[model samples]
Target: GAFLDKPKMEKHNAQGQGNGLRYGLSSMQGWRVEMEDAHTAVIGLPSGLESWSFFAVYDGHAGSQVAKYCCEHLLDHITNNQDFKGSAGAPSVENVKNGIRTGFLEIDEHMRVMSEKKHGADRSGSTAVGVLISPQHTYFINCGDSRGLLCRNRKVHFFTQDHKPSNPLEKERIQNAGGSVMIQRVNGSLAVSRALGDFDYKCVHGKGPTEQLVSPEPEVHDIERSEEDDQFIILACDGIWDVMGNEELCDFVRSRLEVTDDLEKVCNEVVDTCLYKGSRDNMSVILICFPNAPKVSPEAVKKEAELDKYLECRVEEIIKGVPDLVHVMRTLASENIPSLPPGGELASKRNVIEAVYNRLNPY
Candidate 1:
């Protein structure tokens, strides 16, 4: 039940532009036997906070119900909760953070209530990472290992810190809850120290919700928005991060942005490249671009075309010698291909290389 005999390469994609921001998302069920990832992207908010926006990715474990439910309702819980919707005007930074916190707890407990009614058969849990962007501030939210990062001034400006049981703070909480961290997992089982809807872990004697073995509370970080410097924000499941690092993803996205205005294609490349790089779980990514995000540059476009042409020629030359597809790929990997996409490197261009190989070899 861990992996499929063959990966499901089909993808689900979405995109939108509003409130001076453009966003795109892509999700795929790679080698995993089941699709357990869900996401949300909303360009505007309710409750008179029309300028605000929300984006999130939920990575599910054990089951997909919690992730799917959160995708449909977590935003409502955040924006409609008493703490967040108290005033008609936009909530202050403090209120916004408090509201987000309350929302996670509320939903976790709510799911518990729902589960109890159904005899509590489900044990699925999910990690969430997201952004709540008001006109002035961008609030980064996270629970468990899924992460969100901001790219500003053409570099990685900020990224969420993962919550694992082995981390000092998380370990302390697990021990206080009388749970051990074995094999880097809480009590040698759950990999994340904080997540949503792990009702089994939430139950312990005389412990509040956040004091449980796996807390549902999300960490919130607020950064002032900079139209002049901010480029984009990426919210993705650990499946994507498992293959690409923070700076690597930032560089890859920046490189893609310069060559195309199609946000969906940029995101598609990310998921596709991760699958090629051997990620074994469901993959999801949300890319939100600021007004100042990179635009297609003629020079960047030209360089990309030249790189593709160069790769095509190299494949042809390699085939002339042995006509071995695998050999062609190996030879290309051994050479220093300039202008290759950053973070993606040779893997992202595998399709380009294979197409030329297919046409010339035609076997």
Candidate 2:
């Protein structure tokens, strides 16, 4: 639930590969999971489906076993499903979507089998968000709270909806399985109501496997790809998204890319910004670029610099406008600004800057 140090195990801070269809990735422990989150999947089908690319992010909780396992196998499962094979190495949009559905269910069942085979497989589970890219479509599959977003033509085109116990449909399934949601978490414990693993909660009298308190059923969606205008796709865990939203991140990354052609720099800026922006969780991000997306233009960075100044002045105005600094200090806690000392002593004034950035960059 909390971290004191960044874990050293298997963190690929930032890495980028590909040409024409490129992607950059960065994941940091950042005071969460002791770095248990696992995210690594960038593949290109070389044979018949040479046009497709794959990417995904897995955020694990309780432990890293499930997340790691999914990282290694989810995509494989999707590619090797009956429907996928039925496509005979040339899949249609409908076939690909079907394969994704089958793949999700298969992996969930595989985890169950692995558990039974071993003494007791780790009860750990993971949140998954994957993207399948091809000329025909940009298909996204989601099983938990991690996010998938699309930015096209300098605007936020689409974003995946999170699956949690509080969602109306998810709540219905949980109640049918004889479970209750409180504080927006399943069974008052698991934050998500749909994920792979966590099978202990799957046993209910009248519900099917996909209708349990924590189901593994995924939501699959597809959209036509825009070779001429699509900018990029962002897949990240709640760590980065908890502090950054659909629009702010798009703008941030877009501006970063404008400053440098190296997408890795863009990803590093994203993760580092999230941490400094006050996200107390593990962070990971994958940015996939299209051919038509804008490249380095000094104006992007200049625009970012200007926004910083705007944020600074707005916060200063707030500080001076409040006649009673004491009342302001009392409310600053909610705004993520620090309170003053016994004698109204102001230290480095670091807290207010970040708080202002957070305010100006609202979700």
Candidate 3:
């Protein structure tokens, strides 16, 4: 039986203030899988209640504080909002979208106000991709570059679009606010059009904090539940997308999940593949499997076992070569010297001789 260990939470936050450089990777840049059985509400259920589950992928940039804040407060605020409570008996898709959007904006505003109180000079922001899963439907939402992909009948259905500055809609918003979009970045400072911090961009005239030039307005999608939704849903940051396409990534996950129902192992394989493909960015993913998904076949399991062996061999080869490469570079530096001024030929020759002597037997 597949089971999750106690939900262990981790965070990674660092500080640096350059116009567009990220200081450090988010504390949590990996997979988090929660089985339905692992998430029973502490309080008793309401009368005749239907249960629901939540899953999210937060891609933090510049700083991790904003993403950490969302992990801590965004969902709680949504569930506790007066609007959500008022519409509980008869919830609509629009209501949920509005509630989620409001929650995102409220969080951004709160951060800005808090920064002012702290007299801080740093900026922070994060992209959010999430899903609300119910027995009858799945509601997905996205803000910025993090993404969600659904596989139905082995076909890819993207749930959210990465809100990059190059998107036409995003360009319009940036231009309207006297900001330029270049290389898919807002004034070349923020790579995504929308995010949770970035207070400097959010305070343009004629725009409320929620309706800012680069507001993190979530794109929402609703899919009715069906058995055809056989494959698991993948929520991942740009690191995975940097190396794999939608179909390629979906196929990769589908192939692995066939061998093992263990979501953690499957996720680790995805991250490993991304690293092999030379993804320079940090990678994170969350895989949510359906209740009736196929069991791991014996043949598939055998294939995975063989693949793991090959990966282990390659990893060992790379590790062993590190010290050899370091020594080779050091030897080359001793042999080659930078050219000096034309009139200083005597000095250059003497310098080369000294370098060789020093390498022969360093005192």
Candidate 4:
């Protein structure tokens, strides 16, 4: 619940390609008072798991210590474990799931020691959402409200559900632990029913780790790889989901992918659009595209070019009459411009409109 007087517009971006997949990531401090988000992207796994890849986004709250630590060490905890390494050839789906769950719990316990060494002072927690992609399967890992979704055949094929304290199972667990859910939060304090860190809630005398008020257990889903229908996977923090739904983001990414193959640019557009839509949190997103992902199409390219042209002309015309950037944006919004990107709509093209207005007026 922190905000800066003026938002920081700078962005951090990275991209890479490997194992027949392309990935891009973007993060922004946005309106938050502190930048507490962290991420991890690895195209290869260690310990004879070279063909496997992992990607994750950690949305930290209160402080960044827990999230930063997880970003650095979570993969090791997951891969070096017995459950993940005990199998011959490729690990079975159940083994992978069990390994992931064990990893989360182990890491949470490990961090507890670090906090205790610091005299039990750190008060941070983070929501984790990630994908572990192997040659034959894609594993989805989720905890708290951050999300991961699969886009297949240009549609939202699978998505993760948020872990809120109000959820029935979560609520029952909290009540059984002698905790109350008030104002949709655990004891009217923590918003997420499950997360990493937040040791303050894990101190119930007789309850085990997963039965605590805030559990570190991650729910994992493994799906067989689809070389034909699978297009891409999106892992992001709540800042992006707060402004866009699964289908909306899928449509937007598809439209952008159809126009340009630059994965970084697509991710940038998504983060910028969420900012414009008024998400008052730190923003981060990872875009992982399969070979079957959308590619540049001539029709989509032409339509995008024409749309830019129309916006530039419209901006020039409007500036001549009103001479104000805000007024021009409002005017365009009133016109209900067609063919603006589906999820992003006119806001996605604000830069285009701003560029023309600035060139025309020069102030």
Taken over the whole model, the C-alpha lDDT of each candidate is 0.91, 0.76, 0.61, 0.92
For 1-363, candidate 2 gives per-residue lDDT tens digits of 456665332346555555468788888887654776787656467446566788889999888889999988887888887887675557887788888888988998898888888878568889999788876688988989999898888888989999979999999888888889988988898899888888888777777788789988888888898778799889999988887778878877776677677877667767766775567787888988888776877766575567556547755566653334344434443564332221112222334455664565454
Ranking by TM-score: 4, 1, 2, 3
- As for TM-score, the candidate ahead, 1 or 2, is 1
Writing each residue's lDDT as its tens digit, candidate 4 over 163-248 gives 99999999999999999899799999888999999998999999999999998999999888999999999999999999999999
lDDT, candidate 3, equals: 0.61
275, model 1: CA deviation in Å?
A: 1.4
RMSD each, Å: 1.4, 7.7, 14.9, 1.3
Best by TM-score: 4
Which regions of candidate 4 deviate over 4 angstroms? 321-323
Clashes of each: 0, 0, 1, 0
Locate the minimum summed-lDDT window of 10 residues in model 1.
Answer: 317-326
The lowest-lDDT stretch of 10 consecutive residues in candidate 2 is 339-348
- Per-model TM against the reference: 0.97, 0.81, 0.71, 0.97
TM-score of 3: 0.71
How do the residues 1-363 of candidate 1 rate in per-residue lDDT, one tens digit apiece? 678899998879999999999999999998988999999999888768789899999999999999999999999998778898666665788889999999999999999999988886768999999999989999999999999999999888999999999999999999999999997899998999999999989889899999999999999999999989999999999999999999999999999999988988999899988987878889999999998998999999999899999999988777664557777877888898777899998988987898898888786
- Give the Å error, residue 92, model 3: 2.2
The order of the candidates by lDDT, greatest first, is 4, 1, 2, 3
